[PDB]
Every structure is written in structure tokens, then in C-alpha cells.
């Protein structure tokens, strides 16, 4: 797929608001993911012991990981589709070290979209949400093709 420049603009305009507080957004998103789909927490050996949302909120580690994850995504989105180099090391570790099925990349995409909708309603109307969704679908499609070259998904 290919996003138009107007679609990238909408994606990068809400992302600039996320960057005003990366750690806060990274915490919200990972928590939304774990609550919604608790099986995804089992992939994290570091965090699988966390029992409640209050424990999650208080985990410094968890918040440090959310910053790491978001920063990597942000770097991919700012490429506006030319992200081949960035995607390689990410597809290699998620496919052969962590073993994250595409399905889970779909659940986190849903969590990213829930949180932006809640926090940034004025900058995340229907067109901006469709543009974010296309960007995350592109990301997932390229990752999936890389998983296949790497010997992991299907
Ligand atoms: C927006 C999509 C995602 C991004 C951009 C992302 C990014 C990252 C980055 C930058 C790291 C550190 C370096 C590395 O190991 O490659 C990481 C580690 C990891 N990721 Fe992801 N990730 C994403 C989706 C997920 C999902 C959906 C899961 C699991 C349900 C997952 C599970 C993990 C695990 C288990 C690690 C290791 C954490 C630790 O022990 O240090 N990732 N990810």
C-alpha cells in the first residue's frame, strides 16, 4: 500500500502530540494492551508477574519499555513508508527471539488507536484515525513479509 502525503501529515500531526509525553502514552498503550488481551502479557518475561493495573502503573520497568517501543515506532512512522532499514532488526527480534505473532501486532495497533482517540479527540477525528490505521496496516504488512523471509510466519 501507499499513503498519500496528506495521510502522512495527519499521522505525523497527532504523533507530535504523543511526543510531548512519550512515557505517559507508552504506559497507557501497554496497559490497554495487557488488559484487553491478557495473553500478550505472557510474552513478556520481565512483566508477566504484574497482577493488576495498579501494579502496571507503578512499574518503572514497564514505563521504560513503553518509551523504548514507542520511540522505535515513531522512528518508523517519520520515514513515511521508506522504513526498510528500521524494520529489519525489529522483525528479526520479534520473529526469532520474542516470537510475537502478527495477531499480537494487530492488538497493539488497536490499543494505539484507542489511546490516541481518548487523549487527542481534536486531532484524531475520523480521517486522522483512518490515516493512522493505514500507516499501522502498512507497518504490519511489511513486518509480516519480513517474518516470512525470516522463516517465521507461515
Ligand atoms: C508497535 C509495534 C512494536 C514495536 C515498534 C516494538 C518495539 C520493540 C523494541 C524497540 C524492543 C527492544 C529491542 C528488540 O528486542 O527488538 C522490543 C522488545 C520486545 N518486544 Fe516489542 N514492539 C512492538 C510490538 C510488540 C508486541 C505486540 C509484543 C508482545 C505481545 C512485543 C514484545 C516484546 C518483547 C517480549 C520484547 C522484550 C522486552 C524485554 O524483555 O526487554 N513487542 N519491542
Swiss-Prot record:
GO terms for cellular component: extracellular exosome; sarcoplasm. Monomeric. Monomeric heme protein which primary function is to store oxygen and facilitate its diffusion within muscle tissues. Reversibly binds oxygen through a pentacoordinated heme iron and enables its timely and efficient release as needed during periods of heightened demand. Depending on the oxidative conditions of tissues and cells, and in addition to its ability to bind oxygen, it also has a nitrite reductase activity whereby it regulates the production of bioactive nitric oxide. Nitrite binds at residue 65. It is found in: Cytoplasm, Sarcoplasm. One of its GO terms (molecular function) is metal ion binding. SUPFAM superfamilies: Globin-like (SSF46458). It comes from the Eukaryota. It catalyses: Fe(III)-heme b-[protein] + nitric oxide + H2O = Fe(II)-heme b-[protein] + nitrite + 2 H(+); H2O2 + AH2 = A + 2 H2O. The gene is MB. The modification Phosphothreonine is found at residue 68. This is Myoglobin. Its main location: cytoplasm. The modification Phosphoserine is found at residue 4. Residues 2-148 form the Globin domain. PROSITE patterns: GLOBIN. The keyword Protein biosynthesis does not apply. Keywords: Cytoplasm, Heme, Iron, Metal-binding, Muscle protein, Oxidoreductase, Oxygen transport, Phosphoprotein, Transport. Pfam families: Globin. One of its GO terms (biological process) is removal of superoxide radicals. It is an enzyme of class 1 (oxidoreductase). Belongs to the globin family. Its EC number is 1.7.-.-, 1.11.1.-.
Amino acid at each position: 500500500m501507499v499513503l498519500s502525503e496528506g495521510e502522512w501529515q495527519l499521522v505525523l500531526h497527532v504523533w507530535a502530540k504523543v511526543e510531548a509525553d512519550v512515557a505517559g502514552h507508552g504506559q497507557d498503550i501497554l496497559i490497554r494492551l495487557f488488559k484487553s488481551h491478557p495473553e500478550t502479557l505472557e510474552k513478556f518475561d520481565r512483566f508477566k508477574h504484574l497482577k493488576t493495573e495498579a501494579e502496571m502503573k507503578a512499574s518503572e520497568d514497564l514505563k521504560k519499555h513503553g518509551v523504548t517501543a514507542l520511540t522505535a515506532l515513531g522512528a518508523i512512522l517519520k520515514k513515511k513508508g521508506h522504513h526498510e532499514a528500521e524494520l529489519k532488526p525489529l522483525a528479526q527480534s520479534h520473529a526469532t527471539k520474542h516470537k510475537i505473532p502478527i495477531k499480537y501486532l494487530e492488538f497493539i495497533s488497536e490499543a494505539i488507536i484507542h489511546v490516541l482517540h481518548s487523549r487527542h479527540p481534536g486531532n484524531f477525528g475520523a480521517d486522522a484515525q483512518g490515516a493512522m490505521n493505514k500507516a499501522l496496516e502498512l507497518f504490519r504488512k511489511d513486518i509480516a513479509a519480513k517474518y516470512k523471509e525470516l522463516g517465521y510466519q507461515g
